Symmetry: D2
């Protein structure tokens, strides 16, 4: 009968060998994708920097660090920044950049550390709080609704919020999923933070469980240096109404709150329809 | 037909989430395991440092870096060391230790970098060669015989050898698989380099295909200091002493000097004492 | 990766042992489900028999046999019936019933045999053709659109239709997926063929790829609480009419039934199943 | 969050579609295998029929029925036979043959039913017992040692022995795994029940856990497609103990050579080992 004689546990590593699935086909192309950071839109640079300085922010927490491109931007512009993520595969790249730039003193004092949203309160010693916590580039939408009620969303958000000082900023965004769901397609290469130097082809799959949007799964088909490869990633489709509710509730109502358009303000029922929705609040 | 909808590709990551299998039962115990390096045997310390200095070695390449515990011993002792591995999960720990000790200058000059045995000639800029190249703690036995001829072994060894400067040293070891196969057991806590402080419990499975030993798979059952019993599994290619001697010698094209060590003590075939590891040390012939 | 060392190949069997997944949680519940295809609605029995005799049919092909419950009804009513299916697990139960009733001569002449829709022309000796070929209980919706073009549907339908003699009948149905997709729910216990009351609980998931409905996947939660899952290609009424008509090459007469009663487009009553009955012109 | 969203549950079926893995390459070749071991050796048929009538048996239980080729032999020779198996994929073929032969009366009275060794006492109604219970063609070797103690083997054999009525026969065999493990190869086309009519090709893999033989896995390469099957390597001493114990020592026991008797350390080394046990109350 049927059990699977594994050669090594899932999740272990040996010294000679490449990890688990690290050099398959799909991982290969996915690196190309996470690496098509690196020509940051001036639009974005100007806004984020504008905002942080207009609110007198200095101590920053980037909670969906990734390869750290946004943190690097802050770390260069003289902010003092702590960056965390739960992905080793991505923090790899932020740590590698810091080390490369280790002689620059601003980068010597860049702190990169491990952290999970569901335990952020005991993973990051908040202290009294950060002047600004950021979570951009649609990363919150990675966190799936595994237990049905959006209970893990609600806990991720309260915690992220718990990192903010009184009179501080949380800047957290998400892609326009109101658009995506009503269209059924998630358009390629409209990233507003980083212009994609990478021509890449997208198939949108929406899963709807009992009349409730539950997952948007994207299969990216990227073309490879001179040599077509595929990889897949999934998102929770946060609608604007819901998320507003969710994030506001995370502060227990005692917040301010504005919803940004694509970087400029958002009036409900606008002529222009944004690609991303940015939420900025103050505790 | 049954077309299984994955949530994300194998091998990708997202920002919020922990990687692939990173915090399953077995991975959590396996970290404890790769981490019980916490007290290096004085025996070993004395030998390796003895060898390297008696042969006037300085520029060192550690090609199965791991968490870097051997490289750290060399860095500290004033050698200049480049350490590579192909495992990110393990390099993590070498790089973390380096960063922690970043203000010590010797460590500022420790080089940690990615490299795969099958592509080591391209992956590492050997230049003129390294004074000594080391591959210890039975790491070469990780590389499986995927194709059937031992062709990949033969390439991995030829590459490692290519890292050594003329008149230089290759120190490469492997567990006594001649004993393991004839016993059928690979005894726990015999590590000749690092005395372990977990009460690992071990089951040895040998796979024999068409009468040729092909894999030795170990299920370690480790402890949680009413504690916890957790398991994880790791496998090894059972390099017999005769075959390996052959293999490694051939990697230099016969143009070498070759001694095989006992447990750190020289090895006389059919000697009274039976060693746990077999260390092969090699010079090129100038 | 790494080298997964399976105990036995996927799809083999040994003598001592239960097959593959045969007695896991889900499988056991699913048997309860396929087996509650039972107390057959009088509604149905009257319609189907009505239609077949109405058109003087005798030689019948049941192409999605299953456990054979419709086949048995025909066998009993004196028709001469060949029933095929591609599923061994289900044919098991048609064969078992036949053997149980082997003494009754009408059952001695029931033919149960293996067949795939994609190879039906080569799997069933279609001869001159059958007087009627039935494919009911939404079974065609099992066949997925694995390529992307509906090219396998097109071939399955073209094979099925090739089983019908000239002047003969194809009866093929599908659930009202126009309703399901616009609602997003596929309501439980509305099987108009087999009054299926049994405490069943249903979650409907729709997969929509690049704006085109592509799968409806149902997780049944049944009272033993155990869940199992089954999926369907959501054939809309418009496209299916198209598809099935094209399978005959336009050379057909075609009516779509309401729930057993005729269907006028945009009628007050919305049906649960849509039955297509097709006569191949000579 | 990292795992599947399968199209349908492992182990279900839908009406249109072929089952789970039923028409992948390996299955396709495996059918050829389970099917093309069928010109039955005259050697065998003479022995089995010899034995059964020698001991005046009539009511038979075939507990590892398979495609029912041994059962059919008995059915034809006028025995009254119940055959059970736990495999639907194999019973299929026994049932199909019975139906094909339905108008021959002895076949009308052939009973084919589902049964598992671990629950044989609750799956078959022994009644007073069967005159003979057979389990041949190395099928018991299919049953793995999943717990580690051979506890499931001990239960399967106990159960099987419970099918035998007092003064009755259990005939149960297993391939010579003492030979196989000392050689490391399990030789192709040695089947002495049925002429191995397919040209096969065989690779033997032995798994030895902590110095105890645990699995013998065969990759068959048939004329080129490949499939794989695994066996628990029952050594002769062990199995003798195991089966004897299943009767509680309350038995008469003979091993057989290849169909001949077997004296330990004789010249000829057999391919199969047949054990025939007689209950004495």
């Amino acid at each position: 009968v049927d059990s699977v004689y594994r050669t090594r546990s899932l999740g272990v590593a040996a010294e000679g060998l490449p990890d688990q699935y690290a050099d398959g086909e799909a991982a290969r192309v996915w690196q190309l994708y996470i690496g098509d950071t690196r020509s940051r839109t001036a639009e974005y640079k100007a806004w984020l920097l504008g905002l942080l300085r207009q609110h007198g922010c200095h101590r920053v927490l980037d909670v969906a660090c990734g390869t750290g491109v946004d943190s690097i931007m802050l770390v260069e512009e003289g902010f003092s920044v702590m960056s965390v993520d739960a992905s080793d595969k991505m923090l790899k790249y932020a740590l590698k950049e810091r080390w490369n730039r280790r002689k620059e003193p601003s980068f010597d004092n860049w702190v990169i550390e491990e952290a999970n949203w569901l335990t952020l309160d005991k993973d990051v010693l908040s202290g009294d709080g950060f002047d600004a916590v950021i979570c951009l580039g649609n990363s919150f939408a990675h966190l799936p609704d595994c237990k049905g009620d959006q209970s893990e969303h609600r806990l991720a958000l309260k915690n992220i919020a718990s990192m903010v000082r009184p009179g501080g900023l949380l800047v957290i965004d998400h892609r326009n999923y109101d658009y995506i769901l009503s269209t059924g397609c998630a358009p390629p290469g409209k990233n507003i933070y980083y212009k994609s130097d990478l021509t890449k082809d997208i198939t949108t799959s929406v899963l709807t469980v009992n009349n409730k949007a539950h997952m948007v799964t994207l299969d990216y088909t990227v073309q490879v240096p001179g040599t077509f490869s595929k990889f897949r990633l999934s998102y929770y489709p946060h609608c604007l109404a819901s998320f507003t509710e969710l994030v506001r509730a995370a502060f227990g109502g005692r917040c301010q709150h504005s919803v940004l358009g694509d970087f400029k303000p958002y009036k409900p029922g606008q002529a222009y329809v944004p690609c991303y929705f940015i939420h900025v609040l103050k505790k």
